[PDB]
């Protein structure tokens, strides 16, 4: 593993075998969807929404409670972000690295990391353009990357 590293870490979530809501869960799926929409309106990405749901409420998985994934619920409710969340965060990190590199310009480690991050961005954007999540002409340009993350 570790596409851009030599690490072999296996840490991840081990989601349960049970595909149904837990017996102690007594909130409604409609209430969970309403809270999801409220969080999205407050400006939270699907991963943050799921984190807050699982921490502050009893919703273990919005898929096993509402029957749908969080990004799917957001898209059905008309709150889908312009670009996918992981790609957005990759471009945000690339913007941060490029800003630090403009300021420093001696950070060859940062130059190498920027190359890695932009390669990851380009691979993700190729996948999204293939599955038509992004327009076929969508392009990551460094000079307008910040303008596309805001």
């Amino acid at each position: 593993g570790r596409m851009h590293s030599a690490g072999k870490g296996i840490s991840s979530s081990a989601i349960p075998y049970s595909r149904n809501a837990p017996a102690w869960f007594k909130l409604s799926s409609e209430s969970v969807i309403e809270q999801i929409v409220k969080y999205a309106r407050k400006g939270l990405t699907p991963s943050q929404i799921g984190v807050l749901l699982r921490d502050a409420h009893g919703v273990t998985q919005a898929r096993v409670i509402t029957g749908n994934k969080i990004m799917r619920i957001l898209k059905s409710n008309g709150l889908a972000p312009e670009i996918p969340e992981d790609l957005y965060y990759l471009i945000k990190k690339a913007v941060s690295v490029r800003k630090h590199l403009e300021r420093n310009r001696k950070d060859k480690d940062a130059k190498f990391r920027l190359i890695l991050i932009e390669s990851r961005i380009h691979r993700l954007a190729r996948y999204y353009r293939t599955v038509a999540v992004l327009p076929p002409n969508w392009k990551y340009e460094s000079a307008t990357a910040s303008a596309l993350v805001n």
Binding site: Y17, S18, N20, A23
Partner: protein, 184 residues
Amino acid sequence: PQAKILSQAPTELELQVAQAFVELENSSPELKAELRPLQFKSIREIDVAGGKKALAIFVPVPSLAGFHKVQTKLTRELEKKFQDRHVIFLAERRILPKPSRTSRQVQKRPRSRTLTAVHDKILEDLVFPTEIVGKRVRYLVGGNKIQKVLLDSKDVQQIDYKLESFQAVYNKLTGKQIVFEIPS
């Protein structure tokens, strides 16, 4: 009665079930808003090796969560209305055959309509009150397969006495051998 609950062409066996539904709703004003929408279609009777018989009541799948949330109470009453019977509620799920290479194209055959998915849901409906906590498939040396369903030890005291009835019903419906086990 035989018009609001039947949902199909009349069968003599559905008469008792419709009457035992309408009288239980008459005799319960605190439960007079649940059984009203709860209709069903043809019930199937399945033999059991223990001399008993099982009543599989089919609801295709509207308001099956309602049948579930009110099922732990009226199952026992439908058992009491006439004995030597194990009552189980199943969703009536369509199976679309897997398209052939040269077959005419139809629209995408949802994954819920596959034979495997409907059989897994059949198992869930069979053991509704208890969650299935595992599945195994023994591939015997002879060549046949036996599917083992591991059930949750919680609330198993409502289905544990009809495990053989479950096996007979599943064998009748699918034709595959099933065996239940409670992991302790």
